Design a protein around this ligand. Structure first.
Ligand SMILES: NC1=NCc2ccccc21
Ligand SMILES: [Ca+2]
Length: 223
C-alpha cells in the first residue's frame, strides 16, 4: 500500500497473509474454513496466516492453518487477468473471535463514489521497494467505469473496477494482491493489478466480487 496508514493490530480481522515460506499475497476470510484471494496468487504449498499484524513476529493472536485445496475460477485468464479470483480451503476451521473474523459477501455491487478500505503488506513505495511488515490501510473511492476505461483503454472487463485517485500518490502495490477491498462492511473487491503503483492516471484495478457470489457460494457448498 502506497500512501496509506498503519491500520493498527487486528483492526482488519478478515485480512489474511498467504505464506509459502514468506508472505506472497493477501486474502479475505469469508467463513471459518474459506479464504477469497486473487487467481494470480495461485501456487501449491499455501499456509494461511490469520490474526496477523507484524508478519515477521509472533505477537500472540495468529492462527497458522495449511490449505487443503485451492480452486481457481474456471474462466481465469492469466494474460488479461479477467476473473482474477480463487478460493482457498483451510485444513481445519479457524477459531473466530474479535481479531479473526469473516467478512460478508456483498448483496449488491457497490457504486462509483463509494468509499472502501483496502489493506495489505505490499510495497509502500512507488519508486523502489520497501515492505512494511505491519498491516497498512488505505481509504479510497471506487471510480466510475468510464474513468477506469479511459485510464486503461482496452483492458477493463465487466469483472473489474478501479479504485483510488487519478492524481496518484495513494494505491495498492506489489504484495497486496489477493487482499480485500471492503465497502460498507462487505467484500466488494480483490486487489488485482495496476500499471506501477500510485502513478497519475493509473489507479488500482480490482476484481469485482459481486459478480462471483453465486460461484463462491456454490463452490463452498460442494467442496
Ligand atoms: N494497484 C496496483 N498497482 C500495481 C499492483 C500490483 C499488484 C497488485 C496491485 C497493484
Ligand atoms: Ca505475526
Amino acid at each position: 500500500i502506497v500512501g496509506g496508514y498503519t491500520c493498527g493490530a487486528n483492526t482488519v480481522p478478515y485480512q489474511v497473509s498467504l505464506n509459502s515460506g514468506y508472505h506472497f499475497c493477501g486474502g479475505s476470510l469469508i467463513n471459518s474454513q474459506w479464504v477469497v484471494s486473487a487467481a494470480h496468487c495461485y501456487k501449491s504449498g499455501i499456509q494461511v496466516r490469520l490474526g496477523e499484524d507484524n508478519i515477521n513476529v509472533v505477537e500472540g493472536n495468529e492462527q497458522f492453518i495449511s490449505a487443503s485445496k485451492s480452486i481457481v475460477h474456471p474462466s481465469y485468464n492469466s494474460n488479461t487477468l479477467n476473473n482474477d479470483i480463487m478460493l482457498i480451503k483451510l485444513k481445519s476451521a479457524a477459531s473466530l473471535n474479535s481479531r479473526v473474523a469473516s467478512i460478508s459477501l456483498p448483496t449488491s455491487c457497490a457504486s462509483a463514489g463509494t468509499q472502501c478500505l483496502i489493506s495489505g503488506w505490499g510495497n509502500t513505495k512507488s519508486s523502489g521497494t520497501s515492505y512494511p511488515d505491519v498491516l497498512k490501510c488505505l481509504k479510497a473511492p471506487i471510480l466510475s467505469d468510464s474513468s477506469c476505461k479511459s485510464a486503461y483503454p482496452g483492458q477493463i472487463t465487466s469483472n473489474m473496477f478501479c479504485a483510488g485517485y487519478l492524481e496518484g500518490g495513494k494505491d495498492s502495490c506489489q504484495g497486496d494482491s489477493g487482499g480485500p477491498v471492503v465497502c460498507s462492511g462487505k467484500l466488494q473487491g480483490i486487489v488485482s493489478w495496476g500499471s506501477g503503483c500510485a502513478q497519475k492516471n493509473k489507479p488500482g484495478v480490482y476484481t469485482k466480487v459481486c459478480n462471483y457470489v453465486s460461484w463462491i457460494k456454490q463452490t463452498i457448498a460442494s467442496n
